[PDB]
Design a protein around this ligand. Structure first.
Ligand SMILES: [Ca+2]
Ligand SMILES: [Ca+2]
Ligand SMILES: [Ca+2]
Ligand SMILES: [Ca+2]
Lengths: 250, 250
């Protein structure tokens, strides 16, 4: 053996592109130690490939998704090395979440509570993705509980990790908040409870909070499910929580 | 039909118990609407069951884990309802992480960098879990890169989500930080790159940061892997990052 294969590597910018946004891929740290680079071949992971005459190339993805970008660097003697990185493209406008609230509807969500009363509307005031979300206003009367909830056919398969985005205000009479999933027999004689409990002091106030919750893989897949967010209240007061972009795979 | 079955429900405290810590389960919101409750039967999910003569019962778990706690409430006429919640118990002392650093060793981790130099030691100064972690000191000379890394047999199976805990200081000459996993052919002619990129402005400074990263399920399971943390530097300076409790399931 004798010719040394080239070093292949690239970075890209921006790291978090949106659809139809220019991404610049930069292979300039690639090098052939004992010769020169003859080809930069790019596979964009979407069905298209091309080459650059310099170490940089720009590209755009029209569809959201996670793409494998492969660079092959080939030297002046035909020896090659490759480097593959993953790039995530999210939708520039709109919201592809399982519950995205873009149709202007509540998506079956209602409110309940004890020593607290809730109302929910579809809102354009705040959203996590797209233009629309839910706006959930709670009036507490003291120590109590309030829910924003959906009954409850079979919402997720067992094993599924759900992601909730919750906008939680400062100065609110709350002790804790928790997304939940509650499978139950049709007759409600047996109830299963799954939640991600978060203390009010362990939460980003006046900001969006991303909270995950997994339905255990051993739950009966045929049991109807209630999905929702529960707030524990500790004093009198009126506060507004925003909920959007509840999402999971499949 | 005529007898109404009871309402069964409980809460517990603390929500985040450690091993051998008292947990108080409280079924006091359970009620039989048309009679009285005769039995509170508790299944603690660990092999043990018991009853309480009041709505409350205390229990301790000696082993860490996630337990299903089932309450069955039975009324004065033998009708019952059940409510099952999950409780997570973590170890009171020590560290069960895949990389826990409790043996006082580096666990195969080394440092590299360009326009930056790193040193790493096993430390008791800060840890995320248990008594020990890694202490990683980086001297930058300008725009550069530094890694804390492990080569790299087959560290995780494809599909695995790894959790890194990284303590990131304020006032550091850094632009970005990212845990990574880098499968490669034995000859290094083909490299795959997976990372969770975080800007310095999108990170909790002077605090522990929990960052997850998934190795894609389609990676060849036989390729050797480099796992590590990469810091991008932007100016001269000396900064210290603490790393502990890198963890995944299986
Ligand atoms: Ca060469
Ligand atoms: Ca939305
Ligand atoms: Ca009864
Ligand atoms: Ca440790």
């Amino acid at each position: 053996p004798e010719n040394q294969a080239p070093k292949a590597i690239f970075t890209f910018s921006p790291e978090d592109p949106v659809t139809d946004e220019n991404v610049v891929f930069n292979a300039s740290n690639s090098i052939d130690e004992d010769g020169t680079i003859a080809y930069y071949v790019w596979d964009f992971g979407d069905g298209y490939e091309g080459t650059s005459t310099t170490p940089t190339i720009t590209y755009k993805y029209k569809n959201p998704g996670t793409y494998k970008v492969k660079l092959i660097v080939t030297d002046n003697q035909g020896a090659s090395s490759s480097f593959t990185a993953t790039i995530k493209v999210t939708s520039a406008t709109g919201d592809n979440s399982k519950f995205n609230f873009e149709d202007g509807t509540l998506g079956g969500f209602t409110t309940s509570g004890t020593n607290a009363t809730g109302v929910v509307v579809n809102t354009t005031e705040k959203a996590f993705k797209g233009e629309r979300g839910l706006k959930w206003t709670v009036t507490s009367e003291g120590e109590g509980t309030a829910e924003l909830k959906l009954d409850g056919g079979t919402i997720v398969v067992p094993g599924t990790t759900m992601t909730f985005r919750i906008w939680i205000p400062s100065g609110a009479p709350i002790a804790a908040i928790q997304p939940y999933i509650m499978p139950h027999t049709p007759d409600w004689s047996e109830v299963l409870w799954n939640s991600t409990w978060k203390g009010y002091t362990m939460v980003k106030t006046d900001d969006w909070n991303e909270i995950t919750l997994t339905l255990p893989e051993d739950v009966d897949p045929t049991w109807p499910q209630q999905m929702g967010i529960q707030v524990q209240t500790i004093d009198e007061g009126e506060f507004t929580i925003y909920v959007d972009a509840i999402d999971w795979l499949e």
